[PDB]
Amino acid sequence: AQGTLIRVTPEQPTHAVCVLGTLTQLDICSSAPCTSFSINASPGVVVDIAHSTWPLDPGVEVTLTMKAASGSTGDQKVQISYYGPKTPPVKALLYLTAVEISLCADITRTGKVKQRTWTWGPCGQGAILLVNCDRDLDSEDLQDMSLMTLSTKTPKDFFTNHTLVLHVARSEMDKVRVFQATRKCSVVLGPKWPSHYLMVPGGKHNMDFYVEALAFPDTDFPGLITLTISLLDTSNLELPEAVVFQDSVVFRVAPWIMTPNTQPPQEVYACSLKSVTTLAMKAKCKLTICQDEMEIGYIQAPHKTLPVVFDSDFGYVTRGGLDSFGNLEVSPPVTVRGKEYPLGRILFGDSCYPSNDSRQMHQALQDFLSAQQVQAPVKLYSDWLSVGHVDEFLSFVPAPDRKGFRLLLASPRSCYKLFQEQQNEGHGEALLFKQQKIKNILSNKTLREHNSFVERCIDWNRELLKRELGLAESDIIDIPQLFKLKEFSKAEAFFPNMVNMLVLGKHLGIPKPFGPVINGRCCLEEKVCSLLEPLGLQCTFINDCGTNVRRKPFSFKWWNMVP
Amino acid sequence: AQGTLIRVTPEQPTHAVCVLGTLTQLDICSSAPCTSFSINASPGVVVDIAHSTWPLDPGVEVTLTMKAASGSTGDQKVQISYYGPKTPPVKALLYLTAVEISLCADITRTGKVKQRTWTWGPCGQGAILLVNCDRDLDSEDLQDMSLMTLSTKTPKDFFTNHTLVLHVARSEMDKVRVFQATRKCSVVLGPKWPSHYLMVPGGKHNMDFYVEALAFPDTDFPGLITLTISLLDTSNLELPEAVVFQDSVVFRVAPWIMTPNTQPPQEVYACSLKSVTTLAMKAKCKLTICQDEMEIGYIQAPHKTLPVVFDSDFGYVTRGGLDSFGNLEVSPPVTVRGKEYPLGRILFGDSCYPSNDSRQMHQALQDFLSAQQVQAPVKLYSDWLSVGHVDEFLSFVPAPDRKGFRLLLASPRSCYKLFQEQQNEGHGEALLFKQQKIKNILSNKTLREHNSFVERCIDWNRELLKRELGLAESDIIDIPQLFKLKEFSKAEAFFPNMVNMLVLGKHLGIPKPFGPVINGRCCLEEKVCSLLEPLGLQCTFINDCGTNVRRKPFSFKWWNMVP
C-alpha cells in the first residue's frame, strides 16, 4: 500500500504509530554502530524483509505490518539487535501503536458504505454526490445526501496526543457541504471553512457525516470533490502538529441528464385545449394543469434519483430563439462506431458558421451541457428556420424493431411526391386550407425553389445526425412537410408543422395539417399514418401548444458509461 | 470518408458539386416511376454499388467518387436508366462538377505542411500553435507563427456561384488570430470577427494564412482551437447561401514548460558577488548581469521553440512566500508505475490541510500549471518553513549512473550523526560560526526536538516524492543540515541552507556553511563533497543570492507525451 519510514537507533527507543492498511518501512542503518543485525518483535507484528535477512546493507527492505488495533499505547515491540565481529552491541527498541482509521463511503455505486481516484464504468470506483436543488436536522431531511463514515479503533487514551481533522481543498469548499451526525446534525465543512476538528473518543467508534454538492459540473468544475481525513500528532506541546497519516474519498457530482421521447412518459404538464388530456389518457400517463421555457431532466445517485427542472420534490437549475430549451432535444440510446451513448446524445441547433446575422444558443448553456459529459452534445443546423428550433425539422418516436426508435425528419420532397401522386389520380383541384389548389402549389416555381432550399438544410442535418448518432437510412422516416421562406429568407411551416409532435410514449399528438381532402380524408394526415401505424404508433391529430413531459430516467446508471 | 446524398429524378436533370475526398451517396428511388435500374456515367466517375446491381431496393448503396477536379462545370455525367416490366421509361440526368478543397496544416508535427481531431503521442495527429508573447507585415515577422494552406483546383468560372468562408467558433475567436498571405499580410480571423470571405480564383490556386495563439491553456481553455473552411453555394440569387462542404484543421496551443536542473545550462542572469561568474566560467555557460521573482521556461512548436519568462527574443506571461516562483521546481524526467513523465513533473509546496494560518500558492497559478498538462504538478509540504519554498528542503543534481539524477533532501539527522562522529573523535570543542561548540549543539535538548520535528516534515515529503516521482532510496542523498523553529514555530536554517544550491549543470554553487573546522576544513563542507564528488559534481562554496538560469529545452517533444 502507501505509508511511512521509521528510524530506529541504539541510542534510545522510538515510539510510533502505524495505521492499519499502510506500509511501514524501517530504516536500520541510519544510526547503526558491527556488521549484521537481527529483527525480533511482538506476535502482532509481521516483520517481513528482503534483500528476514542478516546483513547491514542499506538496500535491505524491512517492512512492518500490524495485524490489529492495539489495546493500549505501545502494545507491540520491535527489537533491533545489532551484532558483528567479536562483539554483542546494542538492541534498538521500538514501541508501536496500531490504530484503525477508515474514511469510507459508497465507492461501489451500490447504496451501501463499504484507488484514491474516481473512475468510470461498471468496473470503476467512486462515490456519487447529488447537487442540492431547492428554490425559495435529521433523516427528516438527509436521505437525499451521501453518507460518509469514519470508523476508528484505537486505544482509550489515544486522542490525548492525536487529533483528527476533516478537510476539503479551498478550491472545492464552495462546491460541497458536509454535515456531522451526532448519535442533531451540524455543518462541519463548507463554503465557509475548509477544515474542521473531529471530537473522537478512543476505542471503537464511528461517526456519520452527510455530504451534498452545491454545483453541477461546469467549465470551471470538472465535477470531482475530495474529502481528506488527517491524523495529527500533538504529543509535544511545544512543536506544532505533525501529520501522521492522511486518507480520503473522492466524490463525483451527478450530471444533469436529459430524457428522450423513447422513454415511458410519467407525467405531462400544461398551462392556461383538452385533446391532450384525452391523449395522456390513452397513453397510460398522469396529467396535471398549471410554459415551454423549461426542460425536465433528472440527477441520479445509487441512493436516490430525483427529477430536476431546468429553466432560464423537484430540483432546479437556471443556466443562462436558438437560445431557448425548445431548441434542445436528445437522441435515444445509440451506438456510434463502437462508442456507446446509453443516455442518448443531446441535440441542439444553431448555424453552420458564425456571422453578423448568425444566432446560436448562449455560450453558457452549451458549455454547461458539455460539462455534464454523459450526453455529449451535437450541434445541428437550425438557424435557417425563422424561429430556429431543431424540433421544427426533427423528432424521435419509439419503434418496436430495429434500434428501438425512428428518426423523423421533415421532408418537402415527400409532400410534392404525395401531392403529385394526388394530382395524377385526378385530384389536382383539392383545396389546402386564401386557399390554394394542389396544382397551383405544384406549379408554383417560387414555392418549389424555397422548399428545394429547405431540403438542403434538412438534408445537411440528415447527414450530420447520420454521422454523430450512427444512423442508417433504415432508421429514418420522411414525414411529408412543406415550408416557405418569409422573414429575412428564414423558414416557416407552409402548414401545421407535423414533425413538431408531442411523443407521449407510443401515442402521438400531431399538429393537424388541414390538407387536401381526398375520400373525405386529408392526404397528409393519411400519409403520416401509413408511415407510423405499421410501427405501432397511434397517430392522433390536434389543432393549434404549451406542454412539458417528465419522463422515466434511464435504467442505465450514468456512471457506468465510459465518456 | 464523409459526405453528401444526391437525389436524381426522371423529371429534370440534377446539377451538383462533389469535393474530392468525400463520399457522395445517391438516392435513386425517391422520385422513381418499372422495377429495375441501370447506372452508366463518364470515365472520371467510379460508380460503385452494393446490395453495380440492378434491383430497385432502397437498401441498395450507390456511391460516386470523382477521380479529379473538372475542367469546366458539369464535365462528368451520370445517367440513371429506369426500366421494368414491358417498358423502357426515363433516364435521369446528373451533371457533377469535381473540385479540390484542402484546408491543411502541419498535422504531423514535422514543420512541413502535408482525423478531424487532435491526438497526443508519436503516432498522433494535430498542428501546433505558439502563443504570441510580446511586452510593450511579412516573414520579417511571421516565422514564429503556424502556416496553414488552402489549396483549390476548380473550373475557371467556379467561384461565380460559390464562395469560400474561413471561420473560428465565437468561443475561440478571442484566443486565435489568422493572417492572410497575399502573394503584405492582413488579419482575417480574430478576437474581432469569427468569419471571413476568401477571394479565391477558379483553376489551380492556393493561399497562405499565418496563425498564432493569444492564450496558453487555462481552467477555461483546454487548448484546442479549430479553424473550419466552408464552401457555400450562391447560385440562386433569391435563396440564401447553402453550405455545400466543410472541412477543418484542429490546432493545439503549446503549453508553457519548465526546465529542471538536469538540463544543460545555457545562460545565467544576476542582479545588482562574483563567485557566480567564475562558476559559470567552469560550467561552460554564458553569463550576463542586469531578481528571483520570475522563472524562465519555454514554448515549443515543430517549426520553432522559444524561451518564455514567467513573472508576477523572450516571451512573457504574468499569471497571478509559497505564492512566489521560488516555491516552484521541476523533477527531471521520471517514470512512475509505467506512466512516463518526459518533461519532468512540476513540484510546488504548500500545507497538508487548509487552515486560518495555512499558506498556499495562489489558486490561479496552481490551476495554470495544471492546465499545461505536460508536467502534471505535485503538491509538496513546505508551509512548515518560515519562508516556505520547496527549494529550502530539496534539490536535484545531475547523476551519471542510475536514473540520471539524484534527489538531495536536507537532513537534520545526517548532521547530528556527523557532529557526533566528530565529538567522539575528540573535536567536541569545535566552534560553529554568538558561537556555539559542537557539544552544546549536541546536548541542546530544545534544538534537538526542533530538528526532530523538521525531520518529520521533510520525511513526509521524502515519501511524497518517492510515490509521485517513483523514486527509490538509491535515488536520494541526505545532505547534513540543521534547522531552528523561530517565527510562529516556523523553520529557518540553523546555518547556510546548503540544499538551496545553484545547480549549473555539473558544477554546483553551494552556500558555505561556516561549520566546525577540523583539519583546517569545515566538516559539513567536507561531508557534502564525500557525497557529491563520487557522482561527478564539482562542489564550490559561496557566501551570502539573486539568480535565474535559462536552461536547454528537452529534446523530447511535449506533444509526443501521453498525459
From Swiss-Prot, chains A, B:
Q: Which of this chain's residues are annotated to bind Ca(2+) 1?
A: 132, 134, 136, 141, 144
Q: Which InterPro entries match?
A: Cupredoxin, PAD, PAD_C, PAD_central_sf, PAD_N, PAD_N_sf, Prot_Arg_deaminase_cen_dom
Q: Give binding positions for Ca(2+) 5.
A: 293, 311-312
Annotated active site residues, numbered on this chain, are 292, 389, 391, 545
Q: Name the residues that bind Ca(2+) 2.
A: 134, 136, 144, 313
Indicate where this protein is primarily found.
cytoplasm
Explain how, and how many, cofactor molecules are bound.
Binds 5 Ca(2+) ions per subunit.
Q: Which UniProt keywords apply?
A: Calcium, Chromatin regulator, Citrullination, Cytoplasm, Hydrolase, Immunity, Innate immunity, Metal-binding, Nucleus, Transcription, Transcription regulation
What protein am I looking at? Answer: Protein-arginine deiminase type-4
Protein's organism: Homo sapiens
Gene, per the UniProt record:
PADI4
